[PDB]
Amino acid sequence: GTAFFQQQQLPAAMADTFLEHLCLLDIDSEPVAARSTSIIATIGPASRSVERLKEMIKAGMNIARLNFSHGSHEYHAESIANVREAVESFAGSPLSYRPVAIALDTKGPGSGPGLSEQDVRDLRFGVEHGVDIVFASFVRKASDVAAVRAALGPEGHGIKIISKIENHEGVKRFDEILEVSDGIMVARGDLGIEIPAEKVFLAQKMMIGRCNLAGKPVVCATQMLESMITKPRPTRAETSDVANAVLDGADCIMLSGETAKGNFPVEAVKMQHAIAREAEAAVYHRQLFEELRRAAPLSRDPTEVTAIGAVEAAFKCCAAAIIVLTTTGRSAQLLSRYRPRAAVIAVTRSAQAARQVHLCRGVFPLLYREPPEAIWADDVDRRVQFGIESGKLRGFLRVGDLVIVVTGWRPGSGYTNIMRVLSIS
Amino acid sequence: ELGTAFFQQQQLPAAMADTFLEHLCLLDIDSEPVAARSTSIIATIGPASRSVERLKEMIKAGMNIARLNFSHGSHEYHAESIANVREAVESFAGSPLSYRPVAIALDTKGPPGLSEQDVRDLRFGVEHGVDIVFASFVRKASDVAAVRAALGPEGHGIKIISKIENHEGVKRFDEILEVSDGIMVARGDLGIEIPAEKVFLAQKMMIGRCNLAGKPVVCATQMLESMITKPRPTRAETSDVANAVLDGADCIMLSGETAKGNFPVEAVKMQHAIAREAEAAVYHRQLFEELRRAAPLSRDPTEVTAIGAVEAAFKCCAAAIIVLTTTGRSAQLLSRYRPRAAVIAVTRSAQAARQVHLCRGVFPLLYREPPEAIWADDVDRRVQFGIESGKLRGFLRVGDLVIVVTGWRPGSGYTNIMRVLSIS
Amino acid sequence: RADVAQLTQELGTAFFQQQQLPAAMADTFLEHLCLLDIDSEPVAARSTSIIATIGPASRSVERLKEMIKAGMNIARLNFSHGSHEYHAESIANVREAVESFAGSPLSYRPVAIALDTKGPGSGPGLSEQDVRDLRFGVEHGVDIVFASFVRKASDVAAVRAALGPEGHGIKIISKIENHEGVKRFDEILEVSDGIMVARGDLGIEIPAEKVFLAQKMMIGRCNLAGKPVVCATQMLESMITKPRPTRAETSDVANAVLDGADCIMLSGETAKGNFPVEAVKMQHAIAREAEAAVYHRQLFEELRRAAPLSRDPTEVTAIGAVEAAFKCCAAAIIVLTTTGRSAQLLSRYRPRAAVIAVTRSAQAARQVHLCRGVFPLLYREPPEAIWADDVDRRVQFGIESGKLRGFLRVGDLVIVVTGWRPGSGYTNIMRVLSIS
Amino acid sequence: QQQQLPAAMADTFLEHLCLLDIDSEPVAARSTSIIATIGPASRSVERLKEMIKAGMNIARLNFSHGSHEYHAESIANVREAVESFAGSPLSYRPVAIALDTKGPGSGLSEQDVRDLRFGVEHGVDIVFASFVRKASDVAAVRAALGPEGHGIKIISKIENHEGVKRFDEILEVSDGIMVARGDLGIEIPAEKVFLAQKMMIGRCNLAGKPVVCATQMLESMITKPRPTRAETSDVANAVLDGADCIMLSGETAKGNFPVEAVKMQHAIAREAEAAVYHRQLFEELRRAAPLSRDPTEVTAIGAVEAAFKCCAAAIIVLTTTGRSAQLLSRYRPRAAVIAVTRSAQAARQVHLCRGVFPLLYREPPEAIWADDVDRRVQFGIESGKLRGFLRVGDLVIVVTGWRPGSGYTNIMRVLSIS
Ligand SMILES: Nc1c(S(=O)(=O)O)cc2c(c1O)C(=O)c1ccccc1C2=O
Ligand SMILES: Nc1c(S(=O)(=O)O)cc2c(c1O)C(=O)c1ccccc1C2=O
Ligand SMILES: O=P(O)(O)OC[C@H]1O[C@](O)(COP(=O)(O)O)[C@@H](O)[C@@H]1O
Ligand SMILES: O=P(O)(O)OC[C@H]1O[C@](O)(COP(=O)(O)O)[C@@H](O)[C@@H]1O
Ligand SMILES: O=P(O)(O)OC[C@H]1O[C@](O)(COP(=O)(O)O)[C@@H](O)[C@@H]1O
Ligand SMILES: O=P(O)(O)OC[C@H]1O[C@](O)(COP(=O)(O)O)[C@@H](O)[C@@H]1O
Ligand SMILES: O=C([O-])C(=O)[O-]
Ligand SMILES: O=C([O-])C(=O)[O-]
Ligand SMILES: O=C([O-])C(=O)[O-]
Ligand SMILES: O=C([O-])C(=O)[O-]
Ligand SMILES: [K+]
Ligand SMILES: [K+]
Ligand SMILES: [K+]
Ligand SMILES: [K+]
Ligand SMILES: [Mg+2]
Ligand SMILES: [Mg+2]
Ligand SMILES: [Mg+2]
Ligand SMILES: [Mg+2]
């Protein structure tokens, strides 16, 4: 239909140049797709009430951040329990249940060179309480990431380490840090004090670009909607900053004081949600996909090979979604690195992977709870049908849509190799 | 890894260039072609190439399609030539490393409508089971419809390749291509009907439009003309063959060179050698991107699977794309995106195996095994047949990655699956 | 590597590490972002003009001199506040601070005066207060009018009519502040001299989360049209009370420049805030960093591809001069202009080289601040007897001022743009000159 | 529209090919120079006048055949036919004389030393040096031309594997290259010659140096009045590849249709030049060309950019050595490069550069240098109007210098005709 091609900035998406793409942006072209940039909300006095956390989950919060710079272990354990109670209050309806990751933001090394003793204790607290992510403060070199990894012990092997770049050394040693990290956070607060304030945008745009190239998650953080701590609406610079972080290529956007201590935690989440949807439709996918494809090296890994085939197939038919079965989240992450316009619906039995895939843009995790079928092929199909039924319920899919389905040839992680074109019935 | 030697062969340094100009500068005469020759060779069978023994040598040299020119000879003469082609083709039906399907194409004499002789010759083609018709002097869409009507109740599966030989056919090209299975740039008559210095424009335009439409295009006439009397061609002749391949031609043709000349086998060998060199020199980076950008969005799962499979093949430098096809359509749709990987088409149809030679880079395998009771097993047996033939022919080695294209249920029109397999 | 090797041996590796030059030679926009370096220092003069609102915090002659030194190019007078007497006093103070540096072209900095109208309130047509304020502007010789709440082409015709016969030279920058203005944008831009993305009212008239789409669309269309575009409101809002801005604020300023804005504006930051000079200095520092981070390779190619073929010799000379400037990394393009038009046409192709515009018109010297990368040099000398010698004196004046201000260095290449006959509209010559 | 303008505005090379129209007639003058070998079939003064009218720009004398006396007679006949049109200076066409050496066979041969000395004594403009295989071979040819031999342009013939492999070092010291396909097709596999041709043409286009495509281009025309389909295709593809010159050997030296072979190359080259995809070509030439601090190089790119912006009918350039015209030519403008020169040798040698139309200025010098320049520019305009290049209302780009003498080009002006 003609109405379909007027929505989600589709006239601007078919432009032959970036300049004509900008000229074709339409304030009346309403976003159609689900919001793909994850929202991280920092927990605190303003957002710990189980009833308030349910409202923030409904507003769009995907990751709950625990700032270990404030509060005791007892306070953070209560935070975790309240988060989990609000999240599990929706588990009764599996087709609409939203997983929410728990991220521990460390205090940092302070005037020291290595892992502080408080960080060692907080990291072990995280492992004991099953946190999904660590936002490691003031990472300056690859050895800092190794020390965080060592402090998590043998039972914290699955925890994702997102390195916070907050100073000149972190920016200069970026490549070595990214190589050993699961992802990066552009921690603009400290970075804006450590380097000239007028240079932060260069560091942000560089790090987002390099993470997009590496296929690793990147978070844009601090003062995104700062004025919303006290005011019900943000400034023009604030909405622009959120939209530009999304247009830059950020996988996640973050709220600090806006959700931890402010008077508008639910409204700050709703504002980030509304801006991110508008900004994602305004992404010039033609140039982005082409540049991601050209820059990505050749690969002999069947997961990586299937992912680019599926993203290409998804673009060819305007697929509403790419449904992928995943154990660790990796197959969904490899689909995500090519920035498809189609939503990546990731079906998994791992509650931890379902939480952690929120770090990857455009990945919508679905927690599958059923015990395995006796016939593996039937078990794979029930999970694909679960993705279709959830997608229909959530508005991602309709009858007649085309979907790309990504599976593997055998059980277990690391064997994704099949891409199938499916029509929604 | 694949090794430094791997990335110096088949013009791979020139393939990674960021501009077409840089790509030309990086072409290396020492960079040897490794992939199998993907542009099919059509050889005209006449007095100089009719014998069963000569035909076996032409098949070994690379002939994929045998052309019978109905402007010369009689029905009896061409029936004997067809029988000799089939005898030479079936002489290799043992050793699978030598058995190659060979299509039979009937080139009509030409025309106020369809000529009485054309109606009789087209009827002869149906009775003798020809695979293709090269229809002479097609000027408009109604000319194709007349040839289509003459292919009668039994020959609707025969491919009609319209020969564009005059100003009217060039001007009415879009309407002709829409109703034809493919096109032949018949340069001989075209060079007399329009100024000789304009033929290259017509050739480049028609090849481009056929590539865009995803339909086969043949470059024909005087490609190696001097080889009718001389054992080696001129510098202009080898250049013409290489440039037809670089232009985007699916097939290249030999007329008098193989029908009446003194070096028919040498002419086939020469076209084979040039085509291999020219295919490695194709700038796939720009070609694939432009084919992709110009091709409209599709909701046909075969077309969607094909672009996914070609993208996947480039990503891992796949040795081949193995496709299961009954009519040849799934292989044709893979072929339109010009993959560097060979498209191994496994089929139970002898006709589809011969006809897919019209599509660049499609290597047909005719499968004769009895069907398995379980369809999923029958599919795996043909996929393994393609891998084993590929290993035997030199396309594949253990540890290689291949892309496998199949459908979700039996029958034609359901291709929707692309799998990345590691060769064991 | 080979398309920079000889110039790298000549100019040195240090030259090619500054002003984001490694990021500028990238083959993709993605590679360009990856190559951005916080240690790559900006070298070029700041090309995006700063508009500062003059009010209670920035009215004094002494404060205004500090603001001019900090980088203020255009003084905005908001006719929504104050009286005619109040704004006349502000204009006189701006002119006194500006003329305190008139002693030498090396210290002179021309500053435009812009009148921002109150608007039509609930009225469809021009308000009676606007008619009086517009006549005040003509009587006080303002250079620009920022016309509030423009909704259609007839609104700009009404503003033009209210300026009378003596306000023909005044530039009209239409403020787009509502849904109707955005929808009728093309018809408004066609009759306006430029546009202002008035985000404050626009953010109330349309959903706040859609303002960035309107800003990016309008900046793109103005860049395509070759007309000035201003990004305005809340750019450094927190600097009204704090000495440093938020991370969102510096990002917003950098992104307005990266979007293609010719001017950036400060409102309460300079009108009523505690850090007016610091707000101007902050916009100057961010704009210099953001201009070096512009991906000129894609920008110039896209401006070329989108611009139609032209038979106007000024337009033809401008693209030839911008192409020549990029080829040799020219330090500047010196252009002779009467109305500012030849400098504007150079400016639409976004050269990295500074456009030094030599003019005798004091008004054109002030108004060219609306065009990104145009540095106005007012020529005060009496005309020579021979026209060709007058032109050469003006060109040498640009070179000597450029050397003294640091734009030009010995060994640099400059591109010189002149005409064949006197008078406006005859630019047709481009010359490559080596600085000795 | 004419001259493949619908195909020229295409956004992709594929769509450009699809838009090629056999009814879109070429309008611009033929840019690719034709080199014709002068021999028994083309030696007469009367035959040479018809070859000049057919389009011959450079006369090649093959020193593998004939004697010094024979070639001197051929040179005299070429000069007599060329000067028969000098009465009308606005339409006179200069013709270069090129000496093709015999070669080294089994250093520089003693016969080559004598033939090169003959060339200097007879004022040849170009040397096509046979079997160049390294930079030292070019230096030997340069030495054999003596102190009174720097004026002659050395075009190195690449005819074997070593020449192809050491191409970059040969191109660096040569004025240009000839893809000598005859010997190259015997020295390397015949099916690889197209790779060597396309690589060498690309590298010469990148270097901004002339490249000639030679041998068997219209071979069948030695005995037949019309060429084969492969032959016309080969000529068109050499032009589409980026060749500055195309050559006729036996077709003009010993064949039954020498004038027809020249006419055929002229007709094909005009069609192929209009089918060049300038959008991609200019962008790639610009991107690949290095940054430069030379004002001639800087003015050249500015002028070519300005010409495309207004669809300029021509770029009129004043040149002493031909260098300013060569630097304009390397950017492949669609606009004709009309090179107004006082040097007769420069007017002949500039035929090696695609799209350069040489004009010999034979009017008296004006008193004011500034006045003298304007008359050389008006000369270009009057010749252009007479030859069909220009019409009243057209836009031209004029490339002049700031001071007399070679090496000072730095000015580009946009001028409206009449
Ligand atoms: N040139 C010719 C070609 S063609 O250009 O390759 O089409 C084909 C043929 C002949 C040609 O002369 C014959 O003489 C001939 C005689 C008797 C039976 C059959 C043929 C024949 O097929
Ligand atoms: N923010 C303000 C702005 S604006 O937002 O930058 O336009 C402008 C002004 C004021 C602001 O506070 C005043 O208080 C003011 C008082 C008395 C006379 C004139 C002004 C004035 O022009
Ligand atoms: O993204 P991961 O962790 O590699 O998971 C992909 C795996 O998921 C599957 O699709 C389903 O496997 P399971 O039945 O073990 O969940 C496998 O075939 C595939 O290897
Ligand atoms: O190219 P075609 O003619 O559509 O053939 C493709 C068909 O081949 C298959 O892959 C295998 O089908 P069969 O088992 O019937 O041969 C089908 O699933 C698919 O529809
Ligand atoms: O940019 P404008 O307004 O068209 O002015 C450019 C004009 O300036 C000049 O360079 C010099 O003109 P004047 O002698 O009138 O100052 C003209 O040749 C040219 O037409
Ligand atoms: O093309 P070349 O060899 O560099 O020389 C072109 C020369 O032509 C001029 O425009 C005019 O020079 P002349 O007075 O010597 O004819 C010079 O200014 C310029 O240096
Ligand atoms: O730690 C952070 O979030 C910061 O410094 O911005
Ligand atoms: O019929 C043909 O093949 C021709 O005319 O070239
Ligand atoms: O008028 C203004 O400046 C605004 O609305 O932002
Ligand atoms: O010498 C030549 O010209 C050749 O061999 O092609
Ligand atoms: K912290
Ligand atoms: K025939
Ligand atoms: K106002
Ligand atoms: K010779
Ligand atoms: Mg911090
Ligand atoms: Mg014919
Ligand atoms: Mg307003
Ligand atoms: Mg030779």
UniProtKB/TrEMBL annotation, chain C:
It holds the Pfam family PK. Keywords: Allosteric enzyme, ATP-binding, Glycolysis, Kinase, Magnesium, Metal-binding, Nucleotide-binding, Potassium, Pyruvate, Transferase. PROSITE patterns: PYRUVATE_KINASE. Residues 46-280 form the Pyruvate kinase barrel domain. Pathway: Carbohydrate degradation; glycolysis; pyruvate from D-glyceraldehyde 3-phosphate: step 5/5. Residues 316-433 form the Pyruvate kinase C-terminal domain. Its EC number is 2.7.1.40. Its cofactor is K(+); Mg(2+). The keyword Nucleotide-binding applies. This is Pyruvate kinase.
